[PDB]
């Protein structure tokens, strides 16, 4: 088995396992877990923010941010293919009572003039626009990197209208590794940033939200309500400190593996665009195959390669710490074998 | 003052005023208002449905329909410029806890394959898609008529998947007058239809939802929750019975006046597309004007013509019973005057 | 028939029917209905508040008040048998996402020390308490009057904790007639008051909320979201102006008729307590009867008297404009015949 | 320092820490974490239910159960002092749009006849009662045990009305230990039970919900929505398996320590009722003391004992694994020195 379904599947390193076992813990409901308290201090420091909040998932990170940013009946501008809108169970509507206002982007980049256009006038008929969300990297387009200049302009548009900005930075360090832009400088154009520890950085559980002391307080109370108020969570935060402080640099290996994997897949004859591979994700089209995305997933699964389809004709391949160059090469040999068996 | 902001501004006819003063009434919360009961019987019968529910507004018509069709956390597929998404205060999210899934359409017509692609798989990350809403006529695109075939194909898609279909037919009679499709035939492809009395049909207050007995029963309890459970509302249903039975045919005059207004406006030189005017609405673009939409509205208001912006660069003109052909002609002179100033 | 189920069954007076007939109307979504505007102005003036908002029901009046007073997650303290909790479809939880905090009272009066104890401290486990609701008269206890001292003390607790007060004054004018306390004085200890036009004051549709202009502005937008933004609603407001200014003082008849009814019912042998009858409601117990509430209601209905059970063993009788002293004396004869048959 | 604020403060045993280091993990979003999978299997088996779901907190455990049990606008009967009502941030209203219906109890036991009268009839005005919640042990009354006969009679009432039952069993194993009722038999009277790993059973994080397969599937989707869908959560589940399988019996020591603590505190002269100490909690009154609860807490803190106020005259001490019999006696001598200073 070679698991290219997601970078979520990453397993803890031996150093994470030791640190978790011997974590200094307390009751986080009293703010007394010291390893939680230090993870949040580090995260706030790293993003140049006042405060930070550990959460058991990126989904909860994003939804406590929406709650702390909005009142009932607000509208939240977000990209039409973004995670908050497609893969968070409609939570923004049920939990926050807010409307998404989807804006089609280009590989994650919403046209700033479209964002401006989507902001609501004050009129009794209209929800109040109170939040613009930006995802970086943008998952559904293939781990694409949103330009810093795009985020900068959207921040400006938001400040000109008294609207908050949230960065869905589930994979923001990947974006940073690919662009050279430090995450402090990304975060300077947002009121809040959620980032995952449990994807490429290899922690077993959870994410962090960074922002103002005011917002984080409101998000901490939203977390209690949603059920993310844990006890001796320092057992998880120990791994998160390691993930945050020791696992960023090596994301470059994931990017190089993903680039090598795409380059070779095109040489075999698969419909991939190696020029589109910016971070740790490859998109493969089934249009020159006699199967669709789902049938190809089954052939791959049967041959020892796990991937997932993202539409009827597209599959997403994701590299991560538990996929070595040797793994990529053994996967390429499987892809090569099946290719004659799957083409049109 | 010539009012082209909306057909909502229609005032009741003297016949309506007399019927309201004489209405036989009861407490609608016990279902004992006979004028309410007769309007709902007439509305169900007109639309081919088992049952109907009077509501104080079209917005409440849409929102009790959504509540009755959905559970918390469902997604509703709707057109990206439809009234439910654009101009109903985010009620579907606040009141029903449901996620809108906007689909950009063409003149209100969502591509049915785009509707199919929007329906969610069974996956834990994904809400359940339980409703598709369609708007006819489509307001924001200029009172455009959604082709019946589009509604047919989307009703087909929904049924394959067990999804309910709501038609926001706030102006469905304008659509019927222009398309020839009887409202009963549109309604056959829907689980529920809301339509307004208080717009082109000149009633002072209210809309009706038509549908199945069970759904209407659920929608009535949603009405009670949202605050639409009134008492002797037969006073309003008396005007509504007249609106439904006596004011439909003269909608062709609003359409003729709208067409005349648009052809003449184009001749003056405004950015209008008369070939797009099929009902009672005209969209005028300001790309060839000194002013934007909001500056033109102010200039028009100054000159005694009331209009409304639908975007930064588009104004909406609406005709109705209280705009006569002479009103249109007088408004065209005003529109003529201000053209040399604003070009 | 004689209808003692509720005072909602009141029919418009001839004066009202005339007023509705020639109401001067406009589109209330533009704030252009001159009769709505006058009704709101008179309502604000009558209660000593900056502004007012007409709504199609008292339920909508309470729920837009709650929405405008609160944010998601807040707690609302309210009497454990109040209408907002018992008879408003759980709307406060669905619409505003707010937690009721029920506090048992004596005939509507929550002990202020229990109110103060129900207020949440600043802790992450706890909702913020943002609203206290007081109902006057109190429906479920039988039209009981909350003493002005109770309102004052609760108002004082509220101001010292930063909490708003809403009076559910659906029947506030019945309370004012019984206690002699003018409605402005009650309303001076609240941030908002909802009062009904469609019960004892005999309008066919509607209630009004009064309060500060900012709150009213918020509640108007909640009204739009809930479906209460109507068009030429001056037709209803015309009746509501007569209800507000001219129908209050004759409420004393309804109280005299209620107590006459209650004294004669006890004399006959029914389990009523006429000393408890302060406004237009009488509660009759079925303890000494062969039937329960629902059984008694069926027998009464079969004999021409409509009443309403309020528990398994309690029934409610409500007097109103359409039940004269003559109507009462007849109903008492039916109650006499029935007593022998059902004791 | 001696921490008597709560049993939530328990730290992982050495064994737990070893298992955490070497837990086999997988991605739980894919159902692929074998240690999670085994914990859920063990939990379902211990309670005699079809399925189980690990969650990051008991708060999430209760709220996903409420979500899976209810539709919007439903009503939930629960005890007026229960955790879901007082200390879960109003989540049932925001997340589920449901109203609580508080029924006061005696030490967590709602009178079954009071649960009867709290159920709603079918009427358009009323929410639908869909859930009854019982808390065992009952926290705010001081860890009292709800009699199994109270649970069986309420289950009986629930089955008679189509109503689901949820047991908030945060401290259910404390109840089983003090009562001799196996948790499997408690669980037989409920559709679902939530119980905490992270209080007295000493795991660092998390709770478990058990119920039927379809319920748990619905609650797993609610978990995803609320943000409790974690990845390699087997690290947490490794300690949870130890908590569930090896930490239950020694809860007897916390009960012994609590009784010993309380008995000796009374000998010293504090206002404690040792007979009321049924599990691991001691309630102490400030009636015979200079200070209120908040004063006494601060004085105990400066002296090296952490405790919590549960009211303005009541304080709560909680025994747990990390309080030895030595810790207890060191705390007793601190309570001695303070007594004259507050008597
Ligand atoms: Ca991971
Ligand atoms: Ca009208
Ligand atoms: Ca009436
Ligand atoms: Ca613990």
mmCIF file of N, CA, C and O in Angstrom, chain A residues 25-90:
data_model
loop_
_atom_site.group_PDB
_atom_site.id
_atom_site.type_symbol
_atom_site.label_atom_id
_atom_site.label_comp_id
_atom_site.label_asym_id
_atom_site.label_seq_id
_atom_site.Cartn_x
_atom_site.Cartn_y
_atom_site.Cartn_z
ATOM 1 N N UNK A 25 1.037 18.369 31.371
ATOM 2 C CA UNK A 25 -0.366 18.652 31.088
ATOM 3 C C UNK A 25 -1.025 19.362 32.262
ATOM 4 O O UNK A 25 -0.522 19.378 33.384
ATOM 5 N N UNK A 26 -2.195 19.918 31.975
ATOM 6 C CA UNK A 26 -3.091 20.459 32.970
ATOM 7 C C UNK A 26 -4.488 20.481 32.391
ATOM 8 O O UNK A 26 -4.754 19.891 31.346
ATOM 9 N N UNK A 27 -5.383 21.174 33.061
ATOM 10 C CA UNK A 27 -6.775 21.212 32.629
ATOM 11 C C UNK A 27 -6.963 22.444 31.747
ATOM 12 O O UNK A 27 -6.945 23.582 32.232
ATOM 13 N N UNK A 28 -7.096 22.223 30.445
ATOM 14 C CA UNK A 28 -7.150 23.363 29.532
ATOM 15 C C UNK A 28 -8.409 24.193 29.732
ATOM 16 O O UNK A 28 -8.414 25.379 29.388
ATOM 17 N N UNK A 29 -9.473 23.615 30.300
ATOM 18 C CA UNK A 29 -10.669 24.414 30.576
ATOM 19 C C UNK A 29 -10.359 25.515 31.579
ATOM 20 O O UNK A 29 -10.989 26.573 31.561
ATOM 21 N N UNK A 30 -9.384 25.299 32.458
ATOM 22 C CA UNK A 30 -8.901 26.349 33.347
ATOM 23 C C UNK A 30 -7.716 27.122 32.770
ATOM 24 O O UNK A 30 -7.100 27.914 33.496
ATOM 25 N N UNK A 31 -7.385 26.916 31.495
ATOM 26 C CA UNK A 31 -6.207 27.560 30.935
ATOM 27 C C UNK A 31 -4.909 27.107 31.564
ATOM 28 O O UNK A 31 -3.909 27.830 31.507
ATOM 29 N N UNK A 32 -4.888 25.913 32.152
ATOM 30 C CA UNK A 32 -3.768 25.483 32.972
ATOM 31 C C UNK A 32 -2.915 24.398 32.335
ATOM 32 O O UNK A 32 -1.998 23.902 32.988
ATOM 33 N N UNK A 33 -3.182 23.989 31.102
ATOM 34 C CA UNK A 33 -2.277 23.036 30.474
ATOM 35 C C UNK A 33 -1.064 23.800 29.951
ATOM 36 O O UNK A 33 -1.228 24.713 29.135
ATOM 37 N N UNK A 34 0.163 23.482 30.412
ATOM 38 C CA UNK A 34 1.329 24.298 30.042
ATOM 39 C C UNK A 34 1.796 24.031 28.625
ATOM 40 O O UNK A 34 2.397 24.904 27.996
ATOM 41 N N UNK A 35 1.559 22.825 28.111
ATOM 42 C CA UNK A 35 2.024 22.559 26.752
ATOM 43 C C UNK A 35 1.055 23.126 25.720
ATOM 44 O O UNK A 35 1.481 23.586 24.653
ATOM 45 N N UNK A 36 -0.239 23.110 26.031
ATOM 46 C CA UNK A 36 -1.202 23.901 25.268
ATOM 47 C C UNK A 36 -0.808 25.372 25.283
ATOM 48 O O UNK A 36 -0.742 26.028 24.233
ATOM 49 N N UNK A 37 -0.542 25.911 26.480
ATOM 50 C CA UNK A 37 -0.269 27.341 26.617
ATOM 51 C C UNK A 37 0.971 27.746 25.838
ATOM 52 O O UNK A 37 1.032 28.865 25.306
ATOM 53 N N UNK A 38 1.948 26.832 25.725
ATOM 54 C CA UNK A 38 3.179 27.124 24.999
ATOM 55 C C UNK A 38 2.997 26.958 23.498
ATOM 56 O O UNK A 38 3.564 27.733 22.715
ATOM 57 N N UNK A 39 2.222 25.951 23.075
ATOM 58 C CA UNK A 39 1.890 25.833 21.658
ATOM 59 C C UNK A 39 1.188 27.091 21.152
ATOM 60 O O UNK A 39 1.511 27.605 20.072
ATOM 61 N N UNK A 40 0.246 27.614 21.934
ATOM 62 C CA UNK A 40 -0.465 28.816 21.523
ATOM 63 C C UNK A 40 0.462 30.035 21.521
ATOM 64 O O UNK A 40 0.439 30.835 20.581
ATOM 65 N N UNK A 41 1.332 30.160 22.524
ATOM 66 C CA UNK A 41 2.326 31.233 22.507
ATOM 67 C C UNK A 41 3.210 31.155 21.255
ATOM 68 O O UNK A 41 3.396 32.153 20.546
ATOM 69 N N UNK A 42 3.727 29.965 20.941
ATOM 70 C CA UNK A 42 4.580 29.793 19.761
ATOM 71 C C UNK A 42 3.834 30.125 18.476
ATOM 72 O O UNK A 42 4.353 30.831 17.599
ATOM 73 N N UNK A 43 2.622 29.585 18.333
ATOM 74 C CA UNK A 43 1.816 29.835 17.145
ATOM 75 C C UNK A 43 1.535 31.326 16.970
ATOM 76 O O UNK A 43 1.657 31.865 15.861
ATOM 77 N N UNK A 44 1.141 32.009 18.053
ATOM 78 C CA UNK A 44 0.906 33.452 17.977
ATOM 79 C C UNK A 44 2.181 34.183 17.575
ATOM 80 O O UNK A 44 2.175 35.026 16.666
ATOM 81 N N UNK A 45 3.288 33.850 18.236
ATOM 82 C CA UNK A 45 4.594 34.392 17.873
ATOM 83 C C UNK A 45 4.897 34.174 16.394
ATOM 84 O O UNK A 45 5.262 35.115 15.684
ATOM 85 N N UNK A 46 4.752 32.929 15.911
ATOM 86 C CA UNK A 46 5.159 32.601 14.540
ATOM 87 C C UNK A 46 4.341 33.370 13.498
ATOM 88 O O UNK A 46 4.861 33.721 12.433
ATOM 89 N N UNK A 47 3.071 33.644 13.778
ATOM 90 C CA UNK A 47 2.217 34.370 12.847
ATOM 91 C C UNK A 47 2.127 35.861 13.159
ATOM 92 O O UNK A 47 1.378 36.576 12.490
ATOM 93 N N UNK A 48 2.883 36.345 14.139
ATOM 94 C CA UNK A 48 2.872 37.763 14.465
ATOM 95 C C UNK A 48 1.540 38.262 14.985
ATOM 96 O O UNK A 48 1.149 39.400 14.687
ATOM 97 N N UNK A 49 0.836 37.439 15.762
ATOM 98 C CA UNK A 49 -0.488 37.741 16.279
ATOM 99 C C UNK A 49 -0.472 37.802 17.803
ATOM 100 O O UNK A 49 0.461 37.337 18.464
ATOM 101 N N UNK A 50 -1.562 38.343 18.359
ATOM 102 C CA UNK A 50 -1.674 38.548 19.803
ATOM 103 C C UNK A 50 -1.959 37.262 20.554
ATOM 104 O O UNK A 50 -1.449 37.066 21.664
ATOM 105 N N UNK A 51 -2.783 36.388 19.984
ATOM 106 C CA UNK A 51 -3.286 35.256 20.733
ATOM 107 C C UNK A 51 -3.507 34.094 19.777
ATOM 108 O O UNK A 51 -3.470 34.251 18.554
ATOM 109 N N UNK A 52 -3.712 32.914 20.357
ATOM 110 C CA UNK A 52 -3.852 31.689 19.586
ATOM 111 C C UNK A 52 -4.734 30.731 20.363
ATOM 112 O O UNK A 52 -4.853 30.821 21.587
ATOM 113 N N UNK A 53 -5.376 29.826 19.625
ATOM 114 C CA UNK A 53 -6.331 28.885 20.190
ATOM 115 C C UNK A 53 -6.151 27.543 19.504
ATOM 116 O O UNK A 53 -6.295 27.449 18.282
ATOM 117 N N UNK A 54 -5.828 26.521 20.285
ATOM 118 C CA UNK A 54 -5.770 25.153 19.785
ATOM 119 C C UNK A 54 -7.163 24.565 19.598
ATOM 120 O O UNK A 54 -8.013 24.681 20.482
ATOM 121 N N UNK A 55 -7.358 23.859 18.483
ATOM 122 C CA UNK A 55 -8.630 23.202 18.192
ATOM 123 C C UNK A 55 -8.392 21.771 17.720
ATOM 124 O O UNK A 55 -7.353 21.480 17.122
ATOM 125 N N UNK A 56 -9.340 20.859 17.952
ATOM 126 C CA UNK A 56 -9.138 19.459 17.559
ATOM 127 C C UNK A 56 -9.211 19.214 16.060
ATOM 128 O O UNK A 56 -8.889 18.100 15.626
ATOM 129 N N UNK A 57 -9.622 20.196 15.255
ATOM 130 C CA UNK A 57 -9.694 20.000 13.813
ATOM 131 C C UNK A 57 -9.582 21.336 13.104
ATOM 132 O O UNK A 57 -9.876 22.389 13.673
ATOM 133 N N UNK A 58 -9.178 21.281 11.834
ATOM 134 C CA UNK A 58 -9.266 22.473 11.003
ATOM 135 C C UNK A 58 -10.691 22.947 10.791
ATOM 136 O O UNK A 58 -10.945 24.162 10.708
ATOM 137 N N UNK A 59 -11.638 22.006 10.674
ATOM 138 C CA UNK A 59 -13.047 22.383 10.542
ATOM 139 C C UNK A 59 -13.475 23.233 11.724
ATOM 140 O O UNK A 59 -14.110 24.281 11.554
ATOM 141 N N UNK A 60 -13.111 22.821 12.942
ATOM 142 C CA UNK A 60 -13.543 23.623 14.086
ATOM 143 C C UNK A 60 -12.805 24.957 14.119
ATOM 144 O O UNK A 60 -13.417 26.002 14.374
ATOM 145 N N UNK A 61 -11.502 24.945 13.829
ATOM 146 C CA UNK A 61 -10.788 26.206 13.662
ATOM 147 C C UNK A 61 -11.533 27.197 12.778
ATOM 148 O O UNK A 61 -11.787 28.336 13.174
ATOM 149 N N UNK A 62 -11.912 26.767 11.575
ATOM 150 C CA UNK A 62 -12.621 27.651 10.651
ATOM 151 C C UNK A 62 -13.985 28.087 11.207
ATOM 152 O O UNK A 62 -14.390 29.252 11.052
ATOM 153 N N UNK A 63 -14.709 27.174 11.860
ATOM 154 C CA UNK A 63 -16.062 27.513 12.284
ATOM 155 C C UNK A 63 -16.078 28.350 13.559
ATOM 156 O O UNK A 63 -17.006 29.144 13.746
ATOM 157 N N UNK A 64 -15.085 28.212 14.451
ATOM 158 C CA UNK A 64 -15.079 29.122 15.601
ATOM 159 C C UNK A 64 -14.645 30.507 15.145
ATOM 160 O O UNK A 64 -15.052 31.516 15.733
ATOM 161 N N UNK A 65 -13.835 30.581 14.079
ATOM 162 C CA UNK A 65 -13.485 31.872 13.494
ATOM 163 C C UNK A 65 -14.719 32.539 12.880
ATOM 164 O O UNK A 65 -14.984 33.717 13.126
ATOM 165 N N UNK A 66 -15.506 31.792 12.098
ATOM 166 C CA UNK A 66 -16.728 32.365 11.545
ATOM 167 C C UNK A 66 -17.638 32.869 12.662
ATOM 168 O O UNK A 66 -18.136 34.000 12.601
ATOM 169 N N UNK A 67 -17.812 32.078 13.730
ATOM 170 C CA UNK A 67 -18.673 32.508 14.831
ATOM 171 C C UNK A 67 -18.151 33.786 15.475
ATOM 172 O O UNK A 67 -18.909 34.735 15.690
ATOM 173 N N UNK A 68 -16.855 33.822 15.810
ATOM 174 C CA UNK A 68 -16.301 34.994 16.483
ATOM 175 C C UNK A 68 -16.261 36.234 15.592
ATOM 176 O O UNK A 68 -16.130 37.352 16.113
ATOM 177 N N UNK A 69 -16.345 36.064 14.268
ATOM 178 C CA UNK A 69 -16.320 37.173 13.315
ATOM 179 C C UNK A 69 -17.703 37.691 12.948
ATOM 180 O O UNK A 69 -17.800 38.784 12.386
ATOM 181 N N UNK A 70 -18.769 36.922 13.180
ATOM 182 C CA UNK A 70 -20.058 37.227 12.570
ATOM 183 C C UNK A 70 -21.145 37.286 13.624
ATOM 184 O O UNK A 70 -20.991 36.794 14.740
ATOM 185 N N UNK A 71 -22.250 37.907 13.243
ATOM 186 C CA UNK A 71 -23.525 37.756 13.921
ATOM 187 C C UNK A 71 -24.506 37.050 12.990
ATOM 188 O O UNK A 71 -24.259 36.894 11.785
ATOM 189 N N UNK A 72 -25.630 36.620 13.565
ATOM 190 C CA UNK A 72 -26.587 35.826 12.810
ATOM 191 C C UNK A 72 -27.104 36.634 11.635
ATOM 192 O O UNK A 72 -27.387 37.827 11.764
ATOM 193 N N UNK A 73 -27.200 35.985 10.473
ATOM 194 C CA UNK A 73 -27.650 36.675 9.278
ATOM 195 C C UNK A 73 -26.585 37.412 8.487
ATOM 196 O O UNK A 73 -26.911 37.996 7.440
ATOM 197 N N UNK A 74 -25.334 37.424 8.950
ATOM 198 C CA UNK A 74 -24.256 37.965 8.138
ATOM 199 C C UNK A 74 -24.051 37.119 6.887
ATOM 200 O O UNK A 74 -24.514 35.979 6.790
ATOM 201 N N UNK A 75 -23.337 37.702 5.925
ATOM 202 C CA UNK A 75 -22.859 37.005 4.742
ATOM 203 C C UNK A 75 -21.339 36.933 4.799
ATOM 204 O O UNK A 75 -20.681 37.887 5.230
ATOM 205 N N UNK A 76 -20.801 35.799 4.350
ATOM 206 C CA UNK A 76 -19.375 35.480 4.385
ATOM 207 C C UNK A 76 -18.932 35.256 2.951
ATOM 208 O O UNK A 76 -19.338 34.269 2.327
ATOM 209 N N UNK A 77 -18.110 36.164 2.422
ATOM 210 C CA UNK A 77 -17.582 35.986 1.076
ATOM 211 C C UNK A 77 -16.490 34.924 1.094
ATOM 212 O O UNK A 77 -15.551 34.984 1.901
ATOM 213 N N UNK A 78 -16.599 33.939 0.207
ATOM 214 C CA UNK A 78 -15.565 32.920 0.110
ATOM 215 C C UNK A 78 -15.498 32.406 -1.321
ATOM 216 O O UNK A 78 -16.396 32.642 -2.133
ATOM 217 N N UNK A 79 -14.411 31.689 -1.614
ATOM 218 C CA UNK A 79 -14.150 31.217 -2.965
ATOM 219 C C UNK A 79 -15.049 30.035 -3.282
ATOM 220 O O UNK A 79 -15.328 29.202 -2.414
ATOM 221 N N UNK A 80 -15.508 29.966 -4.534
ATOM 222 C CA UNK A 80 -16.618 29.074 -4.857
ATOM 223 C C UNK A 80 -16.254 27.603 -4.676
ATOM 224 O O UNK A 80 -17.155 26.774 -4.482
ATOM 225 N N UNK A 81 -14.962 27.274 -4.692
ATOM 226 C CA UNK A 81 -14.478 25.904 -4.546
ATOM 227 C C UNK A 81 -13.691 25.705 -3.256
ATOM 228 O O UNK A 81 -12.841 24.811 -3.161
ATOM 229 N N UNK A 82 -13.971 26.524 -2.254
ATOM 230 C CA UNK A 82 -13.197 26.521 -1.032
ATOM 231 C C UNK A 82 -13.744 25.484 -0.057
ATOM 232 O O UNK A 82 -14.898 25.062 -0.150
ATOM 233 N N UNK A 83 -12.891 25.088 0.895
ATOM 234 C CA UNK A 83 -13.220 24.027 1.840
ATOM 235 C C UNK A 83 -14.396 24.396 2.738
ATOM 236 O O UNK A 83 -15.257 23.554 3.043
ATOM 237 N N UNK A 84 -14.419 25.631 3.219
ATOM 238 C CA UNK A 84 -15.477 26.043 4.121
ATOM 239 C C UNK A 84 -16.837 25.841 3.476
ATOM 240 O O UNK A 84 -17.809 25.470 4.151
ATOM 241 N N UNK A 85 -16.923 26.032 2.163
ATOM 242 C CA UNK A 85 -18.201 25.935 1.461
ATOM 243 C C UNK A 85 -18.521 24.517 1.011
ATOM 244 O O UNK A 85 -19.690 24.119 1.038
ATOM 245 N N UNK A 86 -17.516 23.735 0.633
ATOM 246 C CA UNK A 86 -17.779 22.433 0.035
ATOM 247 C C UNK A 86 -17.698 21.282 1.021
ATOM 248 O O UNK A 86 -18.513 20.360 0.914
ATOM 249 N N UNK A 87 -16.772 21.318 1.996
ATOM 250 C CA UNK A 87 -16.466 20.145 2.809
ATOM 251 C C UNK A 87 -16.560 20.397 4.312
ATOM 252 O O UNK A 87 -15.896 19.715 5.092
ATOM 253 N N UNK A 88 -17.393 21.331 4.758
ATOM 254 C CA UNK A 88 -17.564 21.533 6.195
ATOM 255 C C UNK A 88 -19.031 21.414 6.614
ATOM 256 O O UNK A 88 -19.494 22.059 7.557
ATOM 257 N N UNK A 89 -19.757 20.518 5.942
ATOM 258 C CA UNK A 89 -21.040 19.966 6.390
ATOM 259 C C UNK A 89 -22.080 21.072 6.537
ATOM 260 O O UNK A 89 -23.034 20.945 7.308
ATOM 261 N N UNK A 90 -21.921 22.161 5.791
ATOM 262 C CA UNK A 90 -22.841 23.253 5.969
ATOM 263 C C UNK A 90 -22.805 23.919 7.328
ATOM 264 O O UNK A 90 -23.757 24.631 7.689
#
